[PDB]
């Protein structure tokens, strides 16, 4: 759920997730996907495509278990859909950390209606 | 859908909805309901309770038509769920504008896990 996703983002990037990633570019936050603005935005694009493959669980509401081990996110067994969801969330947090160097505050609170259409997943 | 909601909020308040209301207090944004911190927060509490009562449509995903007429949000639906959804959204947008006078930025990115339990809807 959003609780685990936000926690993972905080753990990997060190940033308040809502402020930095709650609405960034065309893909981070609500309102689905759009042509990404930069690498950070592309992380969220991939993340949203990852969510589409999920079958049998709700990525927003369903909580799942994971551990912080050797400073790595380790997804619990959970069940197949929840493990897959956990893995989607883990990947986006890692991707956001790797791209922190080009994070641009101008894309914070980017008006998502002014995004071109995303390609299909 | 969230698109119409965000547009209404912008139309009523004049404010970028993500920046001002994407994570405000215990109820504005994602992660359920909590005891409201102030009037702005209480608008979002009422909104979430409004959504809870809906049957037959998806408040997040389902699009609906509305118009801007004499600077008033005018819902353009006869389907009972979409009409009620539109009115839910219109109400929160109006409420947020009406409570800009007590809006407090200290409640932006309020630590949502640490709110008190909301009264039942
Ligand atoms: O949105 C802004 O205009 C600036 C706020 C901000 C931007 C970057 C940070 O790392 C941070 O803690 C706060
Ligand atoms: O995608 C990868 O594999 C690289 C990033 C990485 C590298 C080390 C870690 O412990 C981790 O969680 C992520
Ligand atoms: O997204 C917008 O609407 C533009 C940015 C913006 C600039 C100043 C504000 O006070 C505000 O809410 C938003
Ligand atoms: O416009 C105002 O009345 C006050 C300033 C203001 C308004 C909205 C913001 O998100 C912000 O950082 C500052």
Author numbering:
A (entry chain A), B (entry chain B): 1 to 121
Any passages from the paper?
The most studied PLA2-like proteins are the Lys49-PLA2s, in which the mutations Asp49→Lys and Tyr28→Asn impair the Ca2+ coordination. In this work, we report functional (neuromuscular-blocking and muscle-damage activities) and crystallographicexperiments aimingto studythe possible inhibitory effects of AA and CA onPrTX-I, a Lys49-PLA2 isolated from Bothropspirajai snake venom. The final models are of a stereochemical quality expected for structures with the same resolution, as indicated by r.m.s.d bonds, r.m.s.d. angles and Ramachandran plot analyses.
In monomer B, CA molecules establish hydrogen bonds with Lys20 and Arg118 by water molecules with Gly15, Asn17 and Ser21. Moreover, CA molecules establish hydrophobic contacts with Lys20, Lys115, Ile104, Arg107, Glu108 and Leu121 in monomer A and with Lys15, Lys20 and Lys115 in monomer B. In addition,three PEG 4000 moleculeswere noted in the PrTX-I/CA structure,with two PEGs inside the hydrophobic channels from both monomersand the third PEG moleculeinteracting with Lys7 on monomer B. The PEG molecules found in these sites are found in other Lys49-PLA2s structures. In the PrTX-I/CA crystal structure, four CA molecules interact with the protein. Two of them interact with Lys20, Lys115 and Arg118 residues for both monomers by hydrogen bonds and hydrophobic interactions. Regarding the other CA molecules, an interaction with Gly15, Asn17, Ser21 and Leu121 residues close to the MDiS region was observed, suggesting that this CA molecule may also bind to the membrane disruption site of PrTX-I. The fourth CA molecule interacts with Lys100 and Glu108 residues butno function has beenassignedto these residues; thus,the binding of this molecule can be attributed to a non-specific interaction.
